[PDB]
Amino acid sequence: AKLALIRLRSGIRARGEVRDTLAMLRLHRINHLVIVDDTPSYRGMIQKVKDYITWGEIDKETLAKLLRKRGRLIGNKPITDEYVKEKLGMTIEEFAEKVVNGEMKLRDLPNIKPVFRLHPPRGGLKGSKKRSFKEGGALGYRGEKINELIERML
Amino acid sequence: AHGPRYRVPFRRRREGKTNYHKRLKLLKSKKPRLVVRKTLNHHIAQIVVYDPKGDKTLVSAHTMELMRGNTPSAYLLGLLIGYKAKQAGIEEAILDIGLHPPTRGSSIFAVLKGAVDAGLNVPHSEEIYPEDYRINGEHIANYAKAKLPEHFEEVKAKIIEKFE
Amino acid sequence: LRPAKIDRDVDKPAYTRREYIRGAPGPKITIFDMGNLSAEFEYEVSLHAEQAMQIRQNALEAIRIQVNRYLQKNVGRSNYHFKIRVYPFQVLRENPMAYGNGMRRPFGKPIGLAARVRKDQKILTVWVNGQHLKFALGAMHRAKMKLPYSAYYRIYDKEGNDVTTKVLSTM
Amino acid sequence: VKKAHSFRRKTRGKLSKHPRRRGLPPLTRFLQEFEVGQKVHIVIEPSYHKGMPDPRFHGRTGTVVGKRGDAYIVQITDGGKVKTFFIHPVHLRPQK
RNA sequence: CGGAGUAGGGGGGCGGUGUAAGCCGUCACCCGAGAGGGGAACAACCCAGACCGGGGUUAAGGCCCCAAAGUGCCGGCUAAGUGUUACUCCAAAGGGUGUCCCUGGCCUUAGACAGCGGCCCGUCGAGGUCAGGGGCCCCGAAAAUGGACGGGGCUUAAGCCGGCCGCCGAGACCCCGGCGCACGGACCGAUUGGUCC
RNA sequence: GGUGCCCUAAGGUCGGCUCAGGCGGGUCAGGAAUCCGCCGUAGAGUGCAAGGGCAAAAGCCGGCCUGACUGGACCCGUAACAGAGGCGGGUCCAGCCGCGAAAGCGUGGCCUAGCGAACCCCUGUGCCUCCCCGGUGGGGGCCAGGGAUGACAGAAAAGCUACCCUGGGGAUAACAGAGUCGUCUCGGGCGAGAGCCCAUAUCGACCCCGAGGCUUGCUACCUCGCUGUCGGCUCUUCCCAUCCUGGCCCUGCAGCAGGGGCCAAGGGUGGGGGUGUUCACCCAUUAAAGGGGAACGUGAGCUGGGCUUAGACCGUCGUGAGACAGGU
RNA sequence: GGUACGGCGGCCAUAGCGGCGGGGCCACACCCGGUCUCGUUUCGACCCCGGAAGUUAAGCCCGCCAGCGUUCCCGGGUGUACUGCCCUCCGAGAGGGGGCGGGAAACCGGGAACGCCGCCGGCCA
């Protein structure tokens, strides 16, 4: 399973441990998204940065929209079905299906940038940055509901 | 054994069979050991090598193996053990005495002398050996007049012929 | 003497060891058990602390005297086994400053003693039979008055189970 | 009052034993052997006063680099410096 | 290999001491050496780290007027202008048939007051009476130029509790265009380099 | 809480042995100690503090000895990480030795305290050297050990200034202000009791909870030429925790007067003696002759009695020069 | 392939302490006596030396007992006490609360546990 992580809070007034962990996760700025695998070594880091990010399990339709809209190559170039059909024998939908069901890695697409840069959510965050999603806020683990947010921020 | 602060000694020390300080001093050397124990009626000896799972014995000898507990029997025990060791492929050793005190002129050192004469290199200084008139039997014979040396020398020649 | 709001709280380390404290004082309290001691009463009325607290031996002795005089005038020595459960082990100190040197070398000399109590801890107990619960509650009230913080009383049976509501309803 | 560091400063617990040890250790420790490059834990035995390193390094893990006499040469990395000790095998324990 | 500056630190959290304020240490987030958006104004509380010109969406917080955006929705509480205060920068022990709730016992079709009549009945003849606990408010509650919820003012609120729906709002985030810097490269100079990618 | 030592053994090694206390027997004023047996994980002892270590022992009893030695390497700590002269310590190589049957141990004290640069001098030991050369006496050099600096990484070392000067400091006092409220002023809760009986007319112990910022302290944020002053006279204003004047309540209120409490700050609250005084004390009147704040209101408004320069006297202290939150 | 036998060890109380019943070809012990080696600041009491009249009562060996003590398992106590990170959460303050992660100790009940392993011998047929 692939997890999506979005950064929500700034690193000012935060510990160097957290800052460095976020740098290692490549989450340098706010409203930036990264996709990783649900391994224990990643879950530990997510638990360490639990209070500055949201995360959850992502869906293939959402990933396809994400690649079609906010995906970039070296040079900040858009991704196109031309390029995908050339470098691989697939379309974006099939690539996403695979990626989320194993059998394929995003970096298998040559010159793919590993960070997605989103605008802030339409209608706004409907919960405080100072609290967690469970108790009515915004931070921490959602489930499939990370896709609603990715849609609002796409 | 009277509570959580009671240290229970090693098993061999509870039994009364091993001195671990002297065991340590003897193991500090990598040469093998010549063990000699003595009972009310017999002697036993052997040659031992160290292993951390348990000591391994290579040779042994008993006064039963002889007559098949005194200074002549001990000297003949030393004869046997020294003649047996030189076969197995070991020419070096150091003595071990256990809880037996060292007294000038005892059958333990008689065994040491027997093995030396048999030709096993054992470092020692000839001041504790018993007198040869004690190794002989003159002691017991001259006690008997208030295992004659004959049969002593008989057994001697027997053993030396066997292990020439 | 000095007000009790200085010693009320428990934010300082424990200071209860006399082989190292120089010039520590003796206690002004010697009696902790009063009344009948071998009489196997029914009801046990016990005080309980509402938050962590530090009680002076002066307050303890005043409580003792008042409550015992009340129970004697009303119940009778033949009844009412009365016990104080806590002993003063803490040592209180005051800085000898008030010519003076102010806050130079401030480490207090010992002045008095106090008992430390944690939340929901028993302080004292009255063992009594049914016909004197009124006076046991009166004693609870009188003791409650003479304490730095607030406290609540409960009742217990043989086997030590709570029967407080049932006994309070039916008087 | 500033107090300099010495060999046995703040060692009340670090150099004590559970009352159920209370004596000489089993002899397989005195007679240990290690090879150059082996990783060793530094675990001081408080009943042997010979060949004992500064208790400040109790609980660390070093590597063996050689031998001198009956003592082994152990190297540790304190911050960015290498430090060398000559330690008796009774104060050492192998890693795995 | 060479050139320095630094040897008075402070806010915030933790520890020892002290009536306390403060004193001494500790962590290494901030101020010092840090613009902008908020807290009425606030060195260090919240959002957030800044080349230039523009276009959009959000954050902290807010939406009766001052003042951009709701005289917004549902259920309940308060009658004291209590309150309208995240912190910086807000008075207690003890009490209250003041009101709104929860629980557990005891009497009831003749009970719990008063009353015709000395534990009794004919009548007022329908529910009542004791214990605990919770929410909001009240008493306890006195200071000096004239005056402070930021002000006006506000009572099924413009206050409080439990929840909800829309909108406004940064130099943060997205986008278009311009300047420079670092690294690498190609070509080219009569000296410390230049044109372009 | 301790050290600025001590020890020819309390140092090395070998062998043998096991302690405190209690109980049961026998002496006996407790028996301080000697005799007997049993239990007894150390409840003892260790050369000396504290902590740690230690039982066929590192403790006790004995024997033999001087490794408390010479020539030399490497490493750790004082001083983490991250620099050091001197000082401690650890692992070893050779030499000559001790104990021990042997293996083995031994470079002082079971571990952590008991100590000190450069220059100069003293002693030991074997060698190099002193101006053209060689001799003699005497000098200089290399290595080792001793002689001291406790302000202990090491000057050779007594005071007054009120005749005082220079440079600075709000990094640091007196001084008003800010903070705090232990203390101070003003209160409250509960109820032992006193009050002929009757807690509550009045008083109210012990113990608990507070307000004010008008007393003094604590701190050292502000000012080191801002003004550095106390008291008095003069002039204005505010607070109430009310002394009188207005109106009420309870009383152990007959009346006259008294106690205690509530609402009310509109008006009033004065004159004199001694003392620099504020305050306190006294006198005669009076309805009563309240208490606080405003940079301890008010010196570009006055005064200058006190206090805090330079002159002088007394007492006391000091060898003296001198000094006194002592007096004049 | 046997024996109710022995020497040297390793793990060092799951092995200890205490108790109960059984055994003696060889063996281990108790035991007799001290001239001789060795020795008793008195005592062949303990160590050393010569044996075996004698005994299985002690030690040793076989097996059993959960009585004291130690160690481990399951269940409760209990996700209780404590705790790392964030919070324009509460509360006059003291101090507490929520979310994500960790997690005891006493005490109680029921179980295992009265040692495991390696080397070398002697007697025996």
Chain B 126-145 residues in 7 Å CB range of strand G: 130, 134, 139-140, 142-143
Asked if D2 is an interface residue toward chain B (Cβ–Cβ < 8 A), one would say no
Q: What backbone torsions phi and psi does residue C113 show, to the nearest 5 degrees? A: -140, 155
**Structural contact between residues A103 and A19, judged by C-beta atoms closer than 8 angstroms:** no
B-D CB pairs within 8 A amount to 25
Give chain B's largest Cα–Cα span.
64
Residue C139, amino acid: A
Residues 9-28 of B with CB under 7 A from strand G: 10-12, 14, 17-18, 20, 23
Sheet holding B33-38, edge to edge: B56-62, B43-49, B33-38, B94-96
Name the residue among D21, D24, D28 with its Cβ closest to that of B52: D28
Instruction: Give the separation between CA C109 and CA A17, rounded to whole angstroms.
Output: 46
Strands (E) across chain C are located at 33-34, 43-49, 53-56, 81-84, 90-94, 109-117, 122-128, 151-156
Question: Which nucleotide shows the minimum CA-to-C1' distance to residue D52?
Answer: F90
Task: Give the angle subtended at the CA of A107 by the CAs of A106 and A108, to the nearest 5°.
Answer: 85
Could you tell me which residues are beta bridge partners of residue D44?
none
Residues B23, D30: C-beta atoms closer than 8 Å: no
**What are the beta bridge partners of residue C84?**
C124
Q: For chain D, percent helix, then strand, then coil, each to nearest 5?
A: 5, 30, 60
Question: Residue A75 CA to E50 C1' — how many Å?
Answer: 26
B162 Cβ contacts chain G strand, under 7 Å: no
Distance between the alpha carbon (CA) of A51 and the C1' atom of E42, Å: 29
Those chains having 3 or more beta-carbon pairs within 8 angstroms of chain C are: none
**Distance of alpha carbon A88 from alpha carbon D71, whole angstroms:** 64
Whole-Å CA distances, A83 to A62, A68, A109, B127, C8: 20, 12, 9, 101, 77
Q: From start to end of A89-130, where are the E strands?
A: 116-117
Strand ranges in B50-164 using DSSP code E only, listed in sequence order: 56-62, 94-96
Q: Do D24 and B21 touch (CB under 8 A)?
A: yes
Q: How far apart are CA C67 and CA C168, in angstroms?
A: 21
List bases, strand G, within 7 Å of protein CB.
Answer: 6-13, 15-17, 26-31, 35-38, 47-52, 68-71, 85-89, 94-95, 98-101, 115-123
Question: What span, in angstroms and rounded, lies between the C-alpha atoms of C162 and C155?
Answer: 6
Strands C122-128 and C43-49: antiparallel
CA–CA distance, B54 with B63 (Å, rounded to integer): 26
Q: Tell me the residues of chain D between 15 and 44 that have a Cβ less than 8 Å away from chain B.
A: 19-24, 27-28, 30-31
Resolution (A): 2.7
Task: For residue B43, give how far its alpha carbon lies from the nearest alpha carbon of chain D (Å).
Answer: 28
H helix intervals, chain A: 16-24, 40-48, 60-70, 81-87, 92-100, 146-153
Buried b (16+ CB within 10 A) or exposed e, C26-38: eeebeeeebbbee
Determined by: cryo-EM
User: Is chain C adjacent to chain B, meaning 3+ CB pairs within 8 angstroms?
Assistant: no
CA–CA separation, C165 vs C155, rounded Å?
A: 9
- Whether B20 and D19 lie within 8 Å, measured CB to CB: no
Backbone angles phi, psi at D22, to 5 degrees: 40, 60
C108 touches strand E (CB under 7 A): yes
Q: Which residues contact C85 (CB under 8 A, 6 or more apart)?
A: C32, C122, C123, C124, C125
